Design a protein around this nucleic acid. Sequence first.
RNA 1: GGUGACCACGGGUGACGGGGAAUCAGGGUUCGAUUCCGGAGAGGGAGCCUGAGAAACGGCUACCACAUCCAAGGAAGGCAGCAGGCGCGCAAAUUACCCACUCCCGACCCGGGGAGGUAGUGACGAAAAAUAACAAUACAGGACUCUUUCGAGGCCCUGUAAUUGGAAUGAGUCCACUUUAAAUCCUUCCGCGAGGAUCCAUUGGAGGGCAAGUCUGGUGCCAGCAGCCGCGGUAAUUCCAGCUCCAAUAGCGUAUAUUAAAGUUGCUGCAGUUAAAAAGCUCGUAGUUGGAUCUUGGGAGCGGGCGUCCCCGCCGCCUCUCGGCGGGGCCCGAAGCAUUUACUUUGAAAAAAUUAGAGUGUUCAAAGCAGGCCCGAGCCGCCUGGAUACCGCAGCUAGGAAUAAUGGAAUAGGACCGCGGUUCUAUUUUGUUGGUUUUCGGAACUGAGGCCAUGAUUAAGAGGGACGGCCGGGGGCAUUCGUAUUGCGCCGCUAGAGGUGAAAUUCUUGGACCGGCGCAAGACGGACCAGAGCGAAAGCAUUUGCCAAGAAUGUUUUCAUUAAUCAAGAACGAAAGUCGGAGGUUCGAAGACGAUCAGAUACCGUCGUAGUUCCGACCAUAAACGAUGCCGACUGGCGAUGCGGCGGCGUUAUUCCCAUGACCCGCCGGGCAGCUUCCGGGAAACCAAAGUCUUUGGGUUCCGGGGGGAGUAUGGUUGCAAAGCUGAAACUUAAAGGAAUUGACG
RNA 2: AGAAGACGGUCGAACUUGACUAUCUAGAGGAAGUAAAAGUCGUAACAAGGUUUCCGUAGGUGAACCUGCGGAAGGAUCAUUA
Lengths: 149, 141, 129
Amino acid sequence: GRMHAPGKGLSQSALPYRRSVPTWLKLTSDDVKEQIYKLAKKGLTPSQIGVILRDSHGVAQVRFVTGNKILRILKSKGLAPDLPEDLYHLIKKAVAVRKHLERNRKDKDAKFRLILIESRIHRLARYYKTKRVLPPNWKYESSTASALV
Amino acid sequence: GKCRGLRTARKLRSHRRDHKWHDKQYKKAHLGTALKANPFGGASHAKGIVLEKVGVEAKQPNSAIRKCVRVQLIKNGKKITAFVPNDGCLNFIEENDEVLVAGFGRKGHAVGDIPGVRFKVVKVANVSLLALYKGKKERPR
Amino acid sequence: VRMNVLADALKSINNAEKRGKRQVLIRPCSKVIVRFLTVMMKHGYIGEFEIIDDHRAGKIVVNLTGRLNKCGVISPRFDVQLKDLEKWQNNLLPSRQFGFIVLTTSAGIMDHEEARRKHTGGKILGFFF
RNA sequence: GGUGACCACGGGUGACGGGGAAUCAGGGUUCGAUUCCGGAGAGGGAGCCUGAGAAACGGCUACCACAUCCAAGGAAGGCAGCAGGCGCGCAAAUUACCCACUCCCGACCCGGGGAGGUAGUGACGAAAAAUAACAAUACAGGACUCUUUCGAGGCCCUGUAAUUGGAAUGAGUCCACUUUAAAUCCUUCCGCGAGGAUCCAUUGGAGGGCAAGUCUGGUGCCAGCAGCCGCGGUAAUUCCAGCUCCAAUAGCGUAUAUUAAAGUUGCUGCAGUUAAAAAGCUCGUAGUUGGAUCUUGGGAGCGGGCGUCCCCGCCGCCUCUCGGCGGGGCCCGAAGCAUUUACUUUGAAAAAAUUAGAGUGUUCAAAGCAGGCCCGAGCCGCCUGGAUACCGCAGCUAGGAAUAAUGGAAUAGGACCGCGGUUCUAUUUUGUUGGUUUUCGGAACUGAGGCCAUGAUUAAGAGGGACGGCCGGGGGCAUUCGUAUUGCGCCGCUAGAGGUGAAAUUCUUGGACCGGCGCAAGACGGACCAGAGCGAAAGCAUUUGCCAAGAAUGUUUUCAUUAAUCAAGAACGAAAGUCGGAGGUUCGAAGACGAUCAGAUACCGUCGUAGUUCCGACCAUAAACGAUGCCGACUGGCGAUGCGGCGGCGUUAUUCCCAUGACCCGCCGGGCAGCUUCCGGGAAACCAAAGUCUUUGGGUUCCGGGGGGAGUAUGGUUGCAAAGCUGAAACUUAAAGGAAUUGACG
RNA sequence: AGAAGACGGUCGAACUUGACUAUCUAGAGGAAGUAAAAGUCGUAACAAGGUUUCCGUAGGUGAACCUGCGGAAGGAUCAUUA
Ligand SMILES: [Mg+2]
Ligand SMILES: [Mg+2]
Ligand SMILES: [Mg+2]
Ligand SMILES: [Mg+2]
Ligand SMILES: [Mg+2]
Ligand SMILES: [Mg+2]
Ligand SMILES: [Mg+2]
Ligand SMILES: [Mg+2]
Ligand SMILES: [Mg+2]
Ligand SMILES: [Mg+2]
Ligand SMILES: [Mg+2]
Ligand SMILES: [Mg+2]
Ligand SMILES: [Mg+2]
Ligand SMILES: [Mg+2]
Ligand SMILES: [Mg+2]
Ligand SMILES: [Mg+2]
Ligand SMILES: [Mg+2]
Ligand SMILES: [Mg+2]
Ligand SMILES: [Mg+2]
Ligand SMILES: [Mg+2]
Ligand SMILES: [Mg+2]
Ligand SMILES: [Mg+2]
Ligand SMILES: [Mg+2]
Ligand SMILES: [Mg+2]
Ligand SMILES: [Mg+2]
Ligand SMILES: [Mg+2]
């Protein structure tokens, strides 16, 4: 029921049986990989691309259209970010909590939401150390964090 | 609930270990105290010298005087009251006479009335009250 | 969380047959589920179950009959060494006259009778009777 | 440098280690100084000779620790060999006889052996097993038969007696023999050896638990009884006695250690609303625990019940680069090796005794391991044993691959004489030995090609992460307002008012109280306000701004096992409390008076300090309470509501519609809640959950084991201190307690 | 060959003084508990226990105790009638 909160909710995405492309679609495995390509270039996260591609554009799921999933398309060409998008969203968040804690030293609430956030960082980190996308050294540091965003 | 897992043989052993210093019947037996405290140094009976005869007043609901002996044990020099069982037997025992005192059956509890008397006399000058109060063996002289 | 997908399922197919429910679905599904349910099919303990193939995990839908008093699951799969098999089937089944400890040996998943014919031990899963 | 909470290191032991023991439905629990194995020490240590072999104690050297004789110069001491004594002690044998058995040392058939055997002592303990039987009477009865019954025939019986009666035997004693070494003991037997008054069964009980007398004497809350429940105060089923009976009974009692009993230590397998009990809350390292997902259907046959349905050997792969059972095969020899285990099954190895248990007239049995036989002994000798199973874990071997981990290709690599460049270096070969250079064989390195359907399982009604529109007394920081409140300023009028089961201290014509208008300071945010809202729990409400943060829903957004709970370790934690500081609106411990009361150092009054108010540090606890751990699964209804979404049928409005927005009617997710019920629970109260529990185990955290003593003492630690945290025992104690019932008194 | 002897060194009992820890105890006088169970002074609690009760904290008091503040209902109200 979530990692760090009471709320035991469920709201998630859900795909069909069918996987084969849905025939509206023109494009083809190339023209999608041409487009993911240009969006990442412009500066968007692997999530954020998947977004643009569905609402405005056409692709239910990149994964089905092309062979592989978005990250692999960026990574095998070298547009992938330094660290995982998923993580620096937490780091960027932490640094934001840090900031106003450093002006407002009363906020007891912010002093989970930091501690929790710190803990959801470390936790993440130490698979990225076993799945080896991060080198076995990198570590948080409060000071060096603000830079890392 | 319980830990239930499969490489949990210790969390279990070590659980069922300490949750015996909350048993009462083992903390007598395995701690130390008992051997240290009971004048009967872990020993079934013990010999001691009758230093005086003392009547004890029984616990309220039953009025009566119980007829016991202050003993001093040889091995310790630890003192004692021992209720001399069966009628008119205090009459036998004189001062300074060597008695073999055994327990009461409650092992530490005082028995029934006789408030705070764990021990009962058996022998007297190598005789045995059972023989005297039956009139089989007489008093030695 | 979902640790053991039997206990999950078997609770919900004991726990229907009490209510007299005609049939039930079991949410997570597995190979081990199928393979241990097909054992229950032979001695009659259930009827024909029809596994849905949601693309991910699986669902099953079990035709029940009246016949299952209880099925349960021994949760850690202790390793049963054939000499113990008796001592278990003493204290885990209502009689020596029926009752089936499903377990999982060298030669597949099967009841205790079939591990005894082949003379193998292995890991206890559960029991229905 | 090495070890450590997978708990070291430190301390303790009523600890020489195993082999086993008694207990025991299965699982354990304690004991194993105990004859078998293994270790150690000869008062204690150290060092020593000597010795293959010893740091040897029936050697010695001191010392220490012990102790003997003395001619006072000196000398000799080691039972934890056997006997014995002393002391200790609840608690344990004879200065016995002997090498005859089994064995050992010697130069050895020949001596010696307190190793050892044999006696004695010996309710440590185990086996067997007398303490009478039987006929006829006398009777005392009761199933056939006979009798309406009373009676009788009697095959049946059984009670007591007469013992009426002889028969039978042993306990003893003791001729004799065996035994043995000589005995003894046992086995053999001559001879004597049973009418109870003997050849004499006792220990506890006789209310219940618990089998057995409101039989009879005596005492009279004494004596006394009673493991617990209890009895005893003038008829005691309870004390002391008498008679009768019961249990076991040659044994039987109490002393306590310990096991079942204990579903009261709970792995199997306890408990946590109230009974003893879930941390205040949360984070979190070790530990434990962790979704799904990967060779199959099928084939070929033999065998049970034209085909169908049970039942078996087969389709571990690779190698052949390796053996060989001038070119060979054939396949075993080697290894890729079982990815790397976990798991399972088969071997082998497991000292005997013990154990389980084959075999066996020990007269049976504990035992013993022999015995059996063949034999009239002429056989001058045959025949068989001394079975077997278990023997944890680890270790070794071999099958299997059910499940659990674990592994392999992704900034490219396996193979494919695929090809070469560079280098290396082995060795066959040039009738031999050297030199040079080759060919080739094997490494190492590395240019450049071919092929490889060439590599990513999926996304969890798991999680993590993005975005969307709301949401909310969530948190901070600013800002704004409201009243009342007391304070004061002024003005008006006037004498009482506050307080009260009644009154006074009190406030007051020095004009209080009241009325009006003004300012003041600080408080707190009324109604709206709810089984309404949010947060973690403390939690959280005047307007507006800003600052982060969050649930939920929505989502053919991305990541892809990342997760749950968690010793250890952290964050926060009313009030009260404490140091600093700011402030003093009321209320108000403390404190002062008035009453009330037998008194009130209490309540009820009138004052009022700390504090309640702020900002800064600490403290770290509640009935911190839903007296309900957290995650996860499943099982019924029915109503409501907060949020989000979705759909529809409404309309008020709102405009020409719209968009809305406001109502209505549905559905959906997740929230706070309600009722109802023979799910099912539940000692009960009760509980959609406290349900899924003898039909016992989804994961995991904490924690209780009669009540007090006691949350005490002591120790440690934190704190400025209150105190916080950790946290015993002796002793005492039989219930304390919980749920419901009648009572009965408020 | 070779004794008595002597210089050195090594294991080292032993002895002397410190340290630690273990265990065990002597103690003027002080304060609890329990016994236990029938003394005095009250009467705190259970009935609306005469003042709903209880927790924590604080302060007080001859004694139960009392009073603040914040709690609790384990209440003496599952409601207060838009
Ligand atoms: Mg967590
Ligand atoms: Mg000792
Ligand atoms: Mg000695
Ligand atoms: Mg020695
Ligand atoms: Mg020596
Ligand atoms: Mg000696
Ligand atoms: Mg003895
Ligand atoms: Mg001997
Ligand atoms: Mg015996
Ligand atoms: Mg006799
Ligand atoms: Mg009785
Ligand atoms: Mg026991
Ligand atoms: Mg049992
Ligand atoms: Mg219990
Ligand atoms: Mg709680
Ligand atoms: Mg308001
Ligand atoms: Mg902790
Ligand atoms: Mg506070
Ligand atoms: Mg304060
Ligand atoms: Mg201050
Ligand atoms: Mg007052
Ligand atoms: Mg507490
Ligand atoms: Mg419960
Ligand atoms: Mg259970
Ligand atoms: Mg207790
Ligand atoms: Mg209570």
